[PDB]
Structure 1
Amino acid sequence: QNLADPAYRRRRIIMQNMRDEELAIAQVEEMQAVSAVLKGKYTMTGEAF
């Protein structure tokens, strides 16, 4: 019941996409912080970086 017009469903997927991006950034920052405490050094590596 209720439901929303197709124009509205475009405003929810965008919000959760932004939330997911922010959460990924936060996890990257946390790993970057933690790896510098357990050991003196860390290495940033990636497939295209």
Structure 2
Amino acid sequence: QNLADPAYRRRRIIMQNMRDEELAIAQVEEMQAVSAVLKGKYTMTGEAF
């Protein structure tokens, strides 16, 4: 009933994608803490690294 331009749709996609990347950072950030105070050891290993 109320559309918009793909330009503001592009803005929405940009904001959503920023949100997703921030969430992914916050989530992957806890991996090292989990390893650290879960074993006293940690593995920073993954493809492209």
> RCO (CA 8 Å, sep 6+): is it higher in 1 or 2?
2
Q: Is TM (by shorter chain) over 0.5? A: yes
- Give me the CA root mean square deviation: 0.8
4+ runs deviating over 4 angstroms = none
Q: What is the TM-score normalised by the length of structure 2?
A: 0.89
Structure 2 distance, partners of 1:6, 1:14, is: 12
Could you list the runs of 5+ residues in structure 1 that have no partner in the other structure?
none
| % identical equivalent positions | 100
Q: What is the TM-score normalised by the length of structure 1?
A: 0.89
Could you list the runs of 5+ residues in structure 2 that have no partner in the other structure?
none
Aligned residues: 49
